[PDB]
Design a binder for these strands. Structure first.
Lengths: 297, 100, 54, 142, 49, 49
RNA sequence: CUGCGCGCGCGCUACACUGACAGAGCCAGCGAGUACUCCCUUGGCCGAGAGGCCCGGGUAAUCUUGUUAAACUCUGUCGUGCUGGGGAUAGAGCAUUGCAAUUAUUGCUCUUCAACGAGGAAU
């Protein structure tokens, strides 16, 4: 099994590098197809390449399929997108506190298909090993400061990305009394994402919305009574968890049911939780000059 | 072999007073050699003739019997100071001055 | 070290001593494969010759 | 048959040797014995009262079983946990006056020797001789 | 006398913690650079939006 | 003022520029850990006599 | 005492007999460690201890370090008594870090010996 995970990760990295070179060529091939249909004259370096024309005659059709959106990009999520229900386990750090364990339970209840695991004495490579051995889609690690959580680590499996984020303004479910709160409904939640516009924003949108099981698309625009909101300002994604009734065709009553975060991501690594030496995709550039001026996501 | 190492280092032997053609092959030992001795020029025999206490066996023995061996030692000790400049006795001294 | 085939077979493994483990080697365990210093176990006739010379 | 001390279990050996060093009457005892603690990491002094023989036997066997050992290793060996009261336990070295004086005592009795050739203290050849002899004696009681 | 007297610790360029009095920074009004983005505090307009 | 009322100019010996004797920086060699050096494969195993 | 908005939260240590103490057995694993330097430190003395001192190995699977770690195991002492459970508070002394230790940095010794007898409702 382990040889298959290593081999498939190496094949994925090689295919991504080949896609970089092929994109450098296919930016030139899309000018030849647009000039053929519209008749505007093109560059001589493009029109006088015999290899480009000879291979263009075979590779028209994938460019047309990408224009129509009929195919999907080579990704770690596009293999099993809406086919499998992504199972995900939430774990603490090594010796958790009682409020960290209740918070772990609360963000377990945020996902309708998640499970929680007691860490105890569990070495982190064997944690990764057991996740790949039970075909989990995601793990989420939690770190507390003193009864208040300060970091999440959302890792996609078998070889997918980590998003490590630091938590702020955490208001737990376990602070309000049982007369006012209650047992959270476990229905498949709607999701809304607000303010993600860069390709890095669509990356974090993908690795956050593939944590939830896929919604049945027959009548999802009106059915379902539970929503989860990820909205970012100043690249600190703030998340709420509401439950709603549609009290009229023009009005809706919301009710806050879950914990509130404003998590800020500081590391997105193309590689799982065990790989400390995985190649990072983005990291929070503090101690640079304009790293506080520039806004990502 | 000492004589051939001396012949490839004969620029260093005459310390800048006489520079030589930079012939630097990978192997300094040629395939065919023969160690000989200058006999005599019949026109010059008062100062172009090494005495009995200077006709030595090898070439390295002649270099060592010559002068400026103190000059070689002076240049070697300057190189040794420049190469012991900051390596590890320096860091042992810094660590001792911190620990005191 | 991560992407290492556990069944690899070079033919220097029949003429080298492996890095072993701390249990098999002992207190003198570094992960470095030990090399030869050039010495060899010397037969009795040649040591008879050398000791006659000494 | 032939014998070492490695053929005899720890406690009955060290007790046999303790009873022998005691009986012998040659030993030096410093004098600050009884009024001393063994370590800063301890609460009470030893309960045997005359007990320097127990550590002398334990030291001498420890040295027999290896090349060379110094005062620092013995302090580290004979030390244990100190309760820092209400703050976590930590390991703490034992006293180097005890062990160094034991070594000097057993040196003057010719059962161990200085080893400046490598450092520390080595078992004496006469220490091998007497230790192997009492180790035999222990197995002869059994 | 002011020109000949010793400079104040604010007018010396390098003020280590031995020169000045104890809590003497609280009485000063200096500007300095900060590092990194602060975290946005959740205010009622943010939760309403 | 200083020449009249006889006070020397303030001079700091830590402030006066000096020549700095820099030894050549030599660093230690690489120190590979024992478990990594025993786990890495045969073609890249470390050979130390 | 951090944090959140005398009150609050995370904690450490206990109320002992599956124990405290004193000998004695004696067993890990992830680490780190000194160049233009004083880091990790064995051993030898001195010291009750903390520590001091003389040397020493290591830029390290090579030396510290088998990190002889702690619960733990054994043979003793104590005997249910706030008891030798507990070790707060406090006096006096000796040391180490540091330019500096008063509002007591930390370390050791003697002495002082508080609450706490399993935590209530709840959650």
């Amino acid at each position: 099994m382990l040889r298959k995970q290593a081999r498939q990760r190496r094949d994925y990295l090689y295919r991504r590098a080949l896609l970089l070179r092929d994109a450098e060529i296919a930016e030139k091939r899309a000018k030849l197809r647009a000039a053929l249909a519209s008749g505007k004259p093109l560059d001589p370096k493009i029109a006088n390449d015999k290899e480009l024309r000879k291979d263009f005659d075979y590779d028209v059709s994938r460019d047309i399929a990408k224009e129509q959106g009929e195919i999907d990009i080579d990704d770690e999520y596009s293999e099993l997108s809406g086919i499998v229900d992504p199972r995900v386990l939430v774990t603490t750090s090594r010796d958790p506190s009682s409020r960290l364990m209740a918070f772990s339970k609360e963000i377990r209840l945020m996902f309708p298909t998640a499970i929680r695991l007691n860490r105890g004495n569990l070495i982190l490579p064997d944690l990764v090993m057991s996740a790949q051995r039970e075909r989990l889609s995601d793990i989420i690690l939690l770190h507390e400061h003193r009864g208040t959580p300060t970091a999440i680590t959302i890792s996609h499996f078998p070889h997918g990305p980590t998003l490590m984020a630091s938590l702020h303004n955490v208001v737990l479910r376990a602070d309000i009394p049982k007369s006012i709160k209650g047992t959270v409904s476990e229905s498949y939640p709607h999701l809304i994402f607000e303010g993600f516009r860069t390709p890095l924003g669509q990356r974090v949108v993908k690795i956050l919305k593939h944590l939830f099981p896929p919604r049945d698309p027959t009548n999802n625009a009106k059915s379902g009574n539970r929503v989860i909101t990820f909205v970012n300002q100043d690249d600190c994604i703030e998340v709420r968890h509401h439950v709603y009734v549609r009290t009229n065709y023009n009005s809706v009553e919301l009710s806050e049911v879950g914990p509130r975060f404003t998590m800020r991501p500081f590391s997105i690594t193309m590689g799982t939780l065990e790989n400390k030496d995985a190649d990072v995709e983005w990291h929070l550039s503090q101690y640079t000059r304009t790293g506080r001026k520039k806004n990502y996501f | 072999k000492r004589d051939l190492q001396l012949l490839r280092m004969r620029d260093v032997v005459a310390m800048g007073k006489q520079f030589f053609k930079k012939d630097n092959r990978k192997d300094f030992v040629p395939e065919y050699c023969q160690v000989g001795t200058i006999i005599a020029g019949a026109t010059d025999g008062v100062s172009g003739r090494l005495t009995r206490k200077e006709r030595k066996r090898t070439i390295v023995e002649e270099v060592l019997s010559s002068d400026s061996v103190s000059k070689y030692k002076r240049k070697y000790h300057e190189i040794q100071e420049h190469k012991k400049s900051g390596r590890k006795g320096y860091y042992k001294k810094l660590m001792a001055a911190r620990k005191r | 070290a991560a992407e290492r085939n556990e069944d690899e077979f070079y033919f220097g493994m029949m003429s080298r001593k492996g890095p072993g483990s701390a249990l098999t080697r002992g207190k003198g365990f570094t992960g470095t494969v030990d090399g030869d210093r050039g010495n060899k176990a010397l037969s009795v006739e040649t040591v008879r010759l050398l000791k006659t010379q000494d | 048959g032939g014998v070492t001390v490695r053929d005899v279990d720890a406690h009955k050996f060290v007790a046999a040797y303790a009873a022998f060093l005691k009986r012998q009457g040659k030993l030096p005892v410093p004098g600050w014995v009884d009024t001393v603690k063994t370590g800063n990491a301890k609460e009470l002094p030893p309960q045997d009262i005359d007990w320097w023989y127990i550590r002398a036997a334990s030291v001498a066997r420890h040295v027999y079983l290896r090349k060379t050992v110094g005062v620092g290793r013995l302090r580290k060996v004979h030390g244990s946990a100190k309760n820092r009261g209400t703050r976590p336990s930590h390991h703490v070295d034992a006293s180097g006056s005890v062990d160094r004086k034991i070594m000097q005592a057993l040196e003057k009795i010719q059962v161990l020797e200085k080893d400046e050739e490598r450092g520390g203290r080595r078992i004496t050849q006469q220490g091998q001789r007497d230790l192997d002899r009492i180790a035999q004696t222990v197995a002869e009681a059994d | 006398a002011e020109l000949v007297a010793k400079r104040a610790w604010t007018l010396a360029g390098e003020a280590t913690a031995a020169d000045r009095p104890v809590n003497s920074l609280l009485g000063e009004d200096m500007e300095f650079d900060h590092v990194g983005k602060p975290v946005p505090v959740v205010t009622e307009e943010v939760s309403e939006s | 003022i200083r020449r009249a009322e006889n006070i020397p100019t303030p001079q700091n010996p830590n402030s006066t520029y000096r020549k700095i004797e820099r030894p050549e920086r030599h660093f230690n060699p690489l120190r590979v850990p024992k478990n990594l050096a025993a786990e890495l494969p045969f073609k890249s195993q470390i050979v130390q006599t």
